[PDB]
Amino acid sequence: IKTRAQILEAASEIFASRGYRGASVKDVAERVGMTKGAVYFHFPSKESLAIAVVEEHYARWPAAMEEIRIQGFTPLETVEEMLHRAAQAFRDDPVMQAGARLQSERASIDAELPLPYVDWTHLLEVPLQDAREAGQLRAGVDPAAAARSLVAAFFGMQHVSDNLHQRADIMERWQELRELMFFALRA
Amino acid sequence: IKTRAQILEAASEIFASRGYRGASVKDVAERVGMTKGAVYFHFPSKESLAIAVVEEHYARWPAAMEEIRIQGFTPLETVEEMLHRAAQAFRDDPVMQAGARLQSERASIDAELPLPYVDWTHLLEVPLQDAREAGQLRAGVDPAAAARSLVAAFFGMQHVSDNLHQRADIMERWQELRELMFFALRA
Numbered sequence: 436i437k438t439r440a441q442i443l444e445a446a447s448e449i450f451a452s453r454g455y456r457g458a459s460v461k462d463v464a465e466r467v468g469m470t471k472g473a474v475y476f477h478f479p480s481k482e483s484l485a486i487a488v489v490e491e492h493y494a495r496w497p498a499a500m501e502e503i504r505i506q507g508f509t510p511l512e513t514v515e516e517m518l519h520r521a522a523q524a525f526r527d528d529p530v531m532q533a534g535a536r537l538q539s540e541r542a543s544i545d546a547e548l549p550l551p552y553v554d555w556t557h558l559l560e561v562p563l564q565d566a567r568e569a570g571q572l573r574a575g576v577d578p579a580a581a582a583r584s585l586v587a588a589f590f591g592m593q594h595v596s597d598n599l600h601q602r603a604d605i606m607e608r609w610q611e612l613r614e615l616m617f618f619a620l621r622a
Numbered sequence: 623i624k625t626r627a628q629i630l631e632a633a634s635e636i637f638a639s640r641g642y643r644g645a646s647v648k649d650v651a652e653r654v655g656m657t658k659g660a661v662y663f664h665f666p667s668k669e670s671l672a673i674a675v676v677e678e679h680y681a682r683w684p685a686a687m688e689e690i691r692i693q694g695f696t697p698l699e700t701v702e703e704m705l706h707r708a709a710q711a712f713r714d715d716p717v718m719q720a721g722a723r724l725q726s727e728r729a730s731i732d733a734e735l736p737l738p739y740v741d742w743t744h745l746l747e748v749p750l751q752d753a754r755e756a757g758q759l760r761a762g763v764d765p766a767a768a769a770r771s772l773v774a775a776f777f778g779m780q781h782v783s784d785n786l787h788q789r790a791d792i793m794e795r796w797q798e799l800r801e802l803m804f805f806a807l808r809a
């Protein structure tokens with residue numbers, strides 16, 4: 436039988452390609468192999484399905500940061516590698532593409548989706564605090580401000596890449612912007 | 623009688639507050655003082671009205687850059703002051719707020735709106751080229767890349783500010799990000 440993750444992947448594919456309005460639970464059930472009633476057991480409405488997709492595209496990242504940390508990357512290199520991985524994931528992964536598209540549509544999706552930006556901001560602030568204490572971060576740079584700036588800039592870069600080029604050029608666009616941001620952050 | 627600009631301002635107010643779907647020509651006509659048939663003389667459909675709002679929120683900026691240039695600001699200070707003025711304008715001006723909201727909604731507005739980002743990218747590239755030739759721009763920084771990075775980062779900053787805080791904190795959010803970007807751009 437199909438798992439929650441399998442249903443979520445199918446839902447992600449459809450939301451990424453069609454948006455919330457154009458997606459249906461009927462089409463998710465067909466894609467994934469099961470009846471609508473069976474899907475509703477896992478996700479009782481289209482709204483709850485959308486929420487689960489957005490939540491998942493955030494909740495995955497703490498574990499990634501832990502994987503990087505235990506390899507001994509410095510605080511600022513940890514932030515860099517997280518954003519590298521995010522860029523590849525928006526490029527490739529339907530759950531990320533769907534999470535972003537659902538959040539793009541938030542003003543006209545009647546569903547209580549998680550607040551954008553704040554999870555990644557909170558996530559990155561921690562290594563950025565360590566970077567400050569360590570002497571890695573340029574004097575006067577506030578870690579909370581750096582976290583906000585990085586998340587907003589990265590968000591904007593990936594959004595532009597999506598809107599204009601379906602994220603095909605995302606890695607180059609991130610490289611050129613990251614070079615400036617990290618030049619400004621490094622002591 | 624009402625001018626095109628007056629109709630466009632009323633339309634902007636409604637689009638900014640309600641989005642494209644929730645806006646109507648009927649409500650624009652009521653707001654501005656005139657019959658729907660009289661409004662349709664200027665803008666034959668809701669689509670053409672939306673296009674005019676988005677086009678206007680871009681077309682205004684070349685003149686602003688000229689006003690700054692003739693005061694003798696350096697190439698990089700010209701870029702800085704343009705983005706300062708953009709931040710205040712998104713904060714305050716319904717036409718800017720509407721332009722951004724209509725572009726946010728572009729994937730589900732059936733209207734041929736102008737491509738986002740490219741006008742501002744082209745606009746800023748010119749002074750950034752001058753900055754390079756002048757020796758103002760850090761060695762190795764490509765002007766076209768800097769223009770893209772600045773537009774995407776600024777876009778993201780203002781979007782986050784809108785989504786979370788209705789742009790109330792936009793000037794502070796821009797200051798902290800601009801400090802990093804321009805630290806990285808200046809020779």
Ligand SMILES: CCC[C@@H]1OCC(CO)=C1C(=O)O
Nearest residue numbers: 535538551552555586589590
């Ligand atoms: C560092 C990822 C920033 C990010 O990009 C898309 C998106 C979806 O709203 C984001 C978020 O909410 O944090």
Ligand SMILES: CCC[C@@H]1OCC(CO)=C1C(=O)O
Nearest residue numbers: 722725738739742773776777
């Ligand atoms: C420097 C302004 C960047 C900008 O912010 C909102 C928006 C609307 O799509 C933008 C654009 O298209 O260039």
